[PDB]
mmCIF file with all atom_site columns, C-alpha atoms in Angstrom:
data_model
loop_
_atom_site.group_PDB
_atom_site.id
_atom_site.type_symbol
_atom_site.label_atom_id
_atom_site.label_alt_id
_atom_site.label_comp_id
_atom_site.label_asym_id
_atom_site.label_entity_id
_atom_site.label_seq_id
_atom_site.pdbx_PDB_ins_code
_atom_site.Cartn_x
_atom_site.Cartn_y
_atom_site.Cartn_z
_atom_site.occupancy
_atom_site.B_iso_or_equiv
_atom_site.pdbx_formal_charge
_atom_site.auth_seq_id
_atom_site.auth_comp_id
_atom_site.auth_asym_id
_atom_site.auth_atom_id
_atom_site.pdbx_PDB_model_num
ATOM 1  C CA . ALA R 1 1  ? -7.497  -93.781 114.020 1.00 0.00 ? 1  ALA R CA 1
ATOM 2  C CA . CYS R 1 2  ? -8.261  -90.016 113.830 1.00 0.00 ? 2  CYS R CA 1
ATOM 3  C CA . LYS R 1 3  ? -8.639  -87.065 116.268 1.00 0.00 ? 3  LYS R CA 1
ATOM 4  C CA . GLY R 1 4  ? -11.950 -86.070 117.920 1.00 0.00 ? 4  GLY R CA 1
ATOM 5  C CA . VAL R 1 5  ? -14.331 -83.287 116.773 1.00 0.00 ? 5  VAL R CA 1
ATOM 6  C CA . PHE R 1 6  ? -13.573 -79.515 116.928 1.00 0.00 ? 6  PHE R CA 1
ATOM 7  C CA . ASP R 1 7  ? -9.855  -80.308 116.362 1.00 0.00 ? 7  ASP R CA 1
ATOM 8  C CA . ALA R 1 8  ? -7.832  -77.584 114.568 1.00 0.00 ? 8  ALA R CA 1
ATOM 9  C CA . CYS R 1 9  ? -6.586  -79.366 111.406 1.00 0.00 ? 9  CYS R CA 1
ATOM 10 C CA . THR R 1 10 ? -5.284  -78.355 107.943 1.00 0.00 ? 10 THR R CA 1
ATOM 11 C CA . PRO R 1 11 ? -7.848  -78.501 105.102 1.00 0.00 ? 11 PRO R CA 1
ATOM 12 C CA . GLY R 1 12 ? -6.781  -80.537 102.039 1.00 0.00 ? 12 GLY R CA 1
ATOM 13 C CA . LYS R 1 13 ? -4.407  -82.676 104.191 1.00 0.00 ? 13 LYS R CA 1
ATOM 14 C CA . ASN R 1 14 ? -7.199  -85.108 105.251 1.00 0.00 ? 14 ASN R CA 1
ATOM 15 C CA . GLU R 1 15 ? -5.774  -85.320 108.816 1.00 0.00 ? 15 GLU R CA 1
ATOM 16 C CA . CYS R 1 16 ? -9.197  -85.587 110.549 1.00 0.00 ? 16 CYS R CA 1
ATOM 17 C CA . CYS R 1 17 ? -11.569 -88.589 110.139 1.00 0.00 ? 17 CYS R CA 1
ATOM 18 C CA . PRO R 1 18 ? -13.331 -89.255 106.802 1.00 0.00 ? 18 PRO R CA 1
ATOM 19 C CA . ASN R 1 19 ? -16.836 -88.701 108.294 1.00 0.00 ? 19 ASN R CA 1
ATOM 20 C CA . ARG R 1 20 ? -15.710 -85.239 109.512 1.00 0.00 ? 20 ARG R CA 1
ATOM 21 C CA . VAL R 1 21 ? -14.061 -82.386 107.536 1.00 0.00 ? 21 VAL R CA 1
ATOM 22 C CA . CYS R 1 22 ? -11.546 -79.597 108.319 1.00 0.00 ? 22 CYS R CA 1
ATOM 23 C CA . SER R 1 23 ? -13.512 -76.298 108.295 1.00 0.00 ? 23 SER R CA 1
ATOM 24 C CA . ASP R 1 24 ? -11.731 -73.319 106.656 1.00 0.00 ? 24 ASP R CA 1
ATOM 25 C CA . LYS R 1 25 ? -13.811 -70.436 108.123 1.00 0.00 ? 25 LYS R CA 1
ATOM 26 C CA . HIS R 1 26 ? -13.798 -72.073 111.596 1.00 0.00 ? 26 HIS R CA 1
ATOM 27 C CA . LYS R 1 27 ? -10.365 -73.765 111.106 1.00 0.00 ? 27 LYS R CA 1
ATOM 28 C CA . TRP R 1 28 ? -11.397 -76.902 113.096 1.00 0.00 ? 28 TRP R CA 1
ATOM 29 C CA . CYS R 1 29 ? -12.752 -80.439 112.477 1.00 0.00 ? 29 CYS R CA 1
ATOM 30 C CA . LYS R 1 30 ? -16.568 -80.837 112.497 1.00 0.00 ? 30 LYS R CA 1
ATOM 31 C CA . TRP R 1 31 ? -19.466 -82.984 111.189 1.00 0.00 ? 31 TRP R CA 1
ATOM 32 C CA . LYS R 1 32 ? -20.786 -82.647 107.606 1.00 0.00 ? 32 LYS R CA 1
ATOM 33 C CA . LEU R 1 33 ? -24.476 -83.394 108.284 1.00 0.00 ? 33 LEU R CA 1
#
């Protein structure tokens, strides 16, 4: 369905999973809480 964690993705494009988010300062996918 989506990529794994710590995956470089574009923010605002919603490419990573819904439970995770694309970080802007780190520039990679990660958990929210």
